[PDB]
């Protein structure tokens, strides 16, 4: 039983540690050039190139340090909701309502190939490696794809409602996804079997991310609360809820250390939550529209957070 091993909580252990407190967060630079709402983004390992997708039919690659466009990719469909940047920096994933994960090779920009086979709307894409890719579609089931063969290799199912996002482990061996049925399932990449399911939410989950160490992971639901789940205990580790917030969450990510949790809510800004003491450590404001995408650099230098105002801001 999961409740049998729940002798204590994380807050009662983390309380002894020194609280983080307020963090001085200022918009160092903003990214201008898009003409439509931005829904997803991905950070590279080198933290130099940035990818963004907007409803204007253009998926342009950003340069984070110099704030300019290095590549422009005219998308076939304007209605895109997901985009991914491969760690090798050669291919860039892109989805949308076509149920197709189009892949564009930056190193030539030219279109590599488009990957069809899904029935529900594509919602999330992630590059496991240079040749393998996992996608999230609206057919209440995830799938694993290959750029070389262009076919669906492994299909991960089990959810009742459609899945909206997934995140990859640091070793690219495990991945978790959330759905509307308030379920977060853990699938093995090589085996393809659902190890365990992390339920407990009371609304639709939209955001999910892995801890840097990989033992835990957090989820973002629509009932203005974040729940942390660890693979070791197979239960809800801690909750991040406030009576002030009533709006849903769209993006949740982690820093290098994992002390603070960056969760993008629907109150036209972002909040910073301490992942140990459950204490707010700052509010990331400045966006005049709803925020839907957020990501942290792998080296921890900065954090790009784009909203529906077609602008992405950098916080250090």
């Amino acid at each position: 039983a999961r409740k049998a091993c729940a002798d204590a909580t994380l807050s009662q252990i983390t309380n002894n540690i020194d609280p983080v407190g307020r963090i001085q967060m200022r918009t160092r630079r903003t990214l201008r050039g898009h003409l439509a709402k931005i829904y997803a983004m991905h950070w590279g390992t080198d933290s130099r190139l940035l990818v963004s997708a907007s409803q204007d039919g253009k998926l342009i690659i950003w340069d984070s340090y110099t704030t300019n466009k290095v590549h422009a990719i005219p998308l076939r469909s304007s209605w895109v909701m997901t985009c991914a940047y491969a760690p090798s920096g050669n291919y860039v994933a892109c989805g949308g309502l076509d149920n197709i994960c189009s892949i564009y090779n930056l190193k030539t920009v030219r279109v590599s190939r488009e990957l069809a086979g899904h029935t529900g709307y594509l919602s999330c894409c992630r590059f496991l490696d240079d040749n393998q890719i996992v996608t999230s579609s609206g057919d209440t089931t995830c799938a694993l794809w290959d750029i070389e063969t262009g076919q669906q290799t492994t299909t991960f199912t089990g959810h009742t409602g459609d899945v909206m996002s997934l995140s990859l482990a640091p070793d690219t061996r495990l991945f978790v996804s959330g759905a509307c049925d308030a379920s977060a399932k853990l699938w093995d990449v090589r085996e393809g079997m659902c190890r365990q399911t992390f339920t407990g939410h009371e609304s639709d989950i939209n955001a999910i991310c892995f801890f840097p160490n990989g033992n835990a992971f957090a989820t973002g639901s629509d009932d203005a609360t974040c729940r942390l789940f660890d693979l070791r205990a197979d239960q809800e580790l801690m909750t991040y809820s406030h009576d002030n917030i009533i709006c849903g969450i769209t993006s949740v990510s982690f820093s290098k250390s994992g002390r603070l949790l960056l969760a993008g809510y629907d109150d036209f800004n972002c909040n910073v939550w301490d992942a140990l003491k459950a204490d707010r450590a700052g509010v990331l404001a400045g966006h005049d529209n709803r925020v839907s995408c957020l990501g942290v650099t792998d080296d921890g230098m900065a954090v790009a957070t784009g909203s529906w105002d077609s602008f992405l801001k950098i916080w250090n």
Partner: protein
Amino acid sequence: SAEDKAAVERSKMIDRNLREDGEKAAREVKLLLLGAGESGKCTIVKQMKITGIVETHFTFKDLHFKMFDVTAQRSERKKWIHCFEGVTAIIFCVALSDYDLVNRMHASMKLFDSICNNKWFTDTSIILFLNKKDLFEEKIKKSPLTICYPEYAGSNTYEEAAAYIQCQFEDLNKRKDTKEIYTHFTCSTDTKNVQFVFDAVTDVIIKNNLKDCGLF
């Protein structure tokens, strides 16, 4: 700064293309088509002008129209209906004959009420079409309208029935002055159907023009 100058110079060339390509989206109008009982997104794409979503491009009277048939998408609407906000108009197609089959009109009114009173679809108009006009004529003589609706106005004639189906649709529209909706009965003529589309679309552009010019 030879490498730095080339990056800003190439980015300026990119910004030039986005401003020119972005201006193309301003002239072109976007139309959303959706139906609850599969009645929508039909009998409007077979015109002479003409994978997840069906997109059709055509120009009528120097105006480019864009339609998006959301049919294969069987997932929840609240997760992707926010992407279609800001469009020029929404073409809702409902069948007059879809009232006795299983209840179909009640499902169509529920979906129409969901998108009409949605928080995102409040600034964009909704064009409502009445499909199956030919089949609705002989259906009322045998199958009464009282099955779908308890009150059929007592006339049971097509003149009052077509008006009752039309007038009852505004009851689901909670916002009258805030958002405007259209209603037209589709005809066998293909160019006559798009004639109302052009007249309705060119009116919403006027609605957006006065809001931009400050008159509204």
